[PDB]
Every structure is written in structure tokens, then in C-alpha cells.
Amino acid sequence: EEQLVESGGGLVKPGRSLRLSCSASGFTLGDYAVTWFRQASGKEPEWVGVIRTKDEGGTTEYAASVKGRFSILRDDSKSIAHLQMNSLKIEDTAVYYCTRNGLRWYDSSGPRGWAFDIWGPGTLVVVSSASTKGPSVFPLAPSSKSTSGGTAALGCLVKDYFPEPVTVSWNSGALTSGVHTFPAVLQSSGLYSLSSVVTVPSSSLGTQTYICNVNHKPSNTKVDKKVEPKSC
């Protein structure tokens, strides 16, 4: 099964640089143009740049907003490509994608168009002068106050971190049913805060271990907090 994965996003200061990587598995990346997109603020994907195949000269083109600052490289032997970002600006903050152009057509004049049939999951790049800060993780304890009809709710409060994102899973990923991880909200402190909750049978609170696995890569924070029933 063919797939792409971006890596390397994180916090970077204005004027600094950052390298993203795009890794292909299950196909020969060198058969394809690698096109970089970015997406912010709930808008549509936006073209960043492309590098053509070796066959087409292996050359690059860039959006006007990044020309002169970004550069694309590819290593066909390892089915990988990179986006090198120099002189970063706050407006560069976005989720970056790489894509393969599996669909192509040509006439006598050359390429006419592409469609992008594989995308990576994305990697978030945050350009800010604010300093990174790991979250505090507090349990949201289940109690008669969070139980409804034989169902109980419990969770984790991930408070006061910067920048996005944090990931949250339950029991190392074995618990997925009934989980709601909420979008982070930006507090007036400029720090983020989010909650993750899961509903389970009341009858399991006395016997089943529930641990939320919180990961905040920008700050090298990993937390696995066990959530303990309260008795009220």
C-alpha cells in the first residue's frame, strides 16, 4: 500500500530555517513530481512549490510568497524529498503537505495537468518568537457527577502549552471508542489548552485502568497519566 509521510514540523523563530522531509513507501517517489502544499486557518490547500522528476530535468518552481526563501531537494535512491525553509515569517505558519502526481496527461506541448492522488498526513510548522512550553496534564476524575445511566465519563485536561499540537490517546491506543479530543483553545495568556474525554461503563471504573497518553513534541513532553475514580 502506497503512502507518503511528512516529518520535521515544529516551532521555529522568525528569520530562522527548518527542513521538512517527505518519505514515500510502497512506490518509487522518483517516478513523480513532488508538490508541496500548505493549509492554514480553515482555507483551501495552497501551492508552495514543486520539484519535477529527474526525467523532466529535476528542476523546481515556487509560489511567489516563498521564492528566494524555500528550496526543494529530492533523493530518488531513498524515495524521499525535502522542503528547506529559510528566513521564516509568521505568515508561513501552516500545515504543510507533500503529494504525488499519480494522474498526469500530456499533449505535444508537454504536461497539461496533474491530479494529486496521494497526500501525507501533514506536518504543522509554527513560526513565532514565543518560547515553547510543555503542558500540565490534570485528570478529569469520574464520579457520580459524571455518570449517566450506567455510563461514566472521564478524561485529561492538557493545560497551558505552546505551540500546537498535542496528541492524546488512551491506553496506548487500545481504547478508541467513545473518545472525544477537543480542539485546543487559545487562552488570553497566549498558551493553548485542550481536554480529552472518553465514556465507559460505570461497572469498569473499579477494575479497568484508564491512562491518557499525552505527547507534546515541541517541548519533548510525554505524559501517561492514570485517571482514578473519585467517590462522590
Partner: protein
């Protein structure tokens, strides 16, 4: 250049009914038109190419049609998993790397009252000087809801924040999280912490509360 215009920006279709999305190109692109689906927290996925050809592993209830400048994505018997933003993209005229602004499909399901849960602050947090009280509205529909924080029956104003999930991929509901935040000192000055929830699915407002030092 070739501009993609997508209409409407938002569409609300009941489950199992038919969704119709419009893409219009500022000039003719023949049938070189692709549709993409982007679900919350995910990359886009290729849906249709050639205006009417479904990608690998795309269910049959998705279909596209049109040529020239008017194109249509149709989703028959809409499923809860179809909640996403949908993008069109022409590739008849170089370059191909432009998308329209997208159409969001939201699922108009039946009314669902929320389940309401309350969480007291943790000892860990309180020792550090702060108390976050969290109120949970789980799996309701429609999205509008009123969350009312009361402390010793005093309606609270200006000290809470909330966020809402995207419409759930399995049952098309929303869940809502409201955090009330106080200093330890203010927290320890009062007894009853309550949230009051009003929603279209509730025949009367629902209250969950606790007394500090009870949990």
C-alpha cells in the same frame, strides 16, 4: 488564470438523502476536473478525476458529472462519515495546483439531547494555585447549546472557555467542553459549583453540580 468557484460554502443534508455540490470554472476546462474530500484532522483524499471517474476505493454513492465550466459532485444516501470539506481542482490548463475554496457538508440529523457531566479540579492543580472546573456536553445535535456556570447560585460571567468537536464521523453529533477557571483563593471561598445546560433536546434545563471538599 482559471478560478474555481464552489457553491454553496456550506450544505446541510439529512442522512441518506442526496447532496449536490457545484463547481464552476472561470473558463472551460473540458472534463479535466478533480474532486477531493478532506475530513477533520486529515489530508485531502482524491475522490473523482476526469470529472466523472471515481478514484480507487471510493464508494459508489459518490459521483461527479459536467464538462466545460459547470461541474457537480453528487453524494447519494449521505453517510455520517461523509462529513468533510470538498474541493475541486482543474488540470486542463497549466498549472494544476489550484483548488477552489471548498464546500463543507454537514449532516442534518435528528435532535439529540446532550449528556451532561461535571468534573471538579484535581488536587494536583489546586496545590499549584488554580482550579479548572470542566463541564461536558456529550453527543448532542444541533450544535447550538447554552452553558451556564453558577457558583453558590451566582451566575458566572467572563471566567470560562469552551470548544466544540467537529460533527462526529459515526453518529453525526457534537460534544462540547466548557472550562471554568479560578484562583485557588477564589475557589476556596465558595461551596457549590454548577453548570446549567439548555438545549433543544432538553424539555427543561439540566444542572450538574458538586460541593467543594465533597470529592
Amino acid at each position: 488564470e482559471i478560478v474555481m468557484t464552489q457553491s454553496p460554502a456550506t450544505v446541510s443534508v439529512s442522512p441518506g438523502e442526496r447532496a449536490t455540490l457545484s463547481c464552476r470554472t472561470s473558463q472551460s476546462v473540458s472534463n479535466k476536473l478533480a474532486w477531493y474530500q478532506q475530513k477533520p484532522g486529515q489530508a485531502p483524499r482524491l475522490l473523482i478525476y476526469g470529472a466523472s471517474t471515481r478514484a480507487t476505493g471510493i464508494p459508489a454513492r459518490f459521483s461527479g458529472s459536467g464538462s466545460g465550466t459547470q461541474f457537480t459532485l453528487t453524494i447519494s444516501s449521505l453517510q455520517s462519515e461523509d462529513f468533510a470539506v470538498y474541493y475541486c481542482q482543474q488540470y486542463n490548463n497549466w498549472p494544476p495546483w489550484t483548488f477552489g475554496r471548498g464546500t463543507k457538508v454537514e449532516i442534518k440529523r435528528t435532535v439529540a439531547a446532550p449528556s451532561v457531566f461535571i468534573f471538579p479540579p484535581s488536587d494536583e492543580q489546586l496545590k499549584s494555585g488554580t482550579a479548572s472546573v470542566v463541564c461536558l456536553l456529550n453527543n448532542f445535535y444541533p450544535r447550538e447549546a447554552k452553558v451556564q456556570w453558577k457558583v453558590d447560585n451566582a451566575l458566572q460571567s467572563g471566567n470560562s472557555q469552551e470548544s466544540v468537536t467537529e460533527q462526529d464521523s459515526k453518529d453525526s453529533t457534537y460534544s462540547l467542553s466548557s472550562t471554568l477557571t479560578l484562583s485557588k483563593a477564589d475557589y476556596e471561598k465558595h461551596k457549590v459549583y454548577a453548570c446549567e445546560v439548555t438545549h433543544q433536546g432538553l424539555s427543561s434545563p439540566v444542572t450538574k453540580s458538586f460541593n467543594r471538599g465533597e470529592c
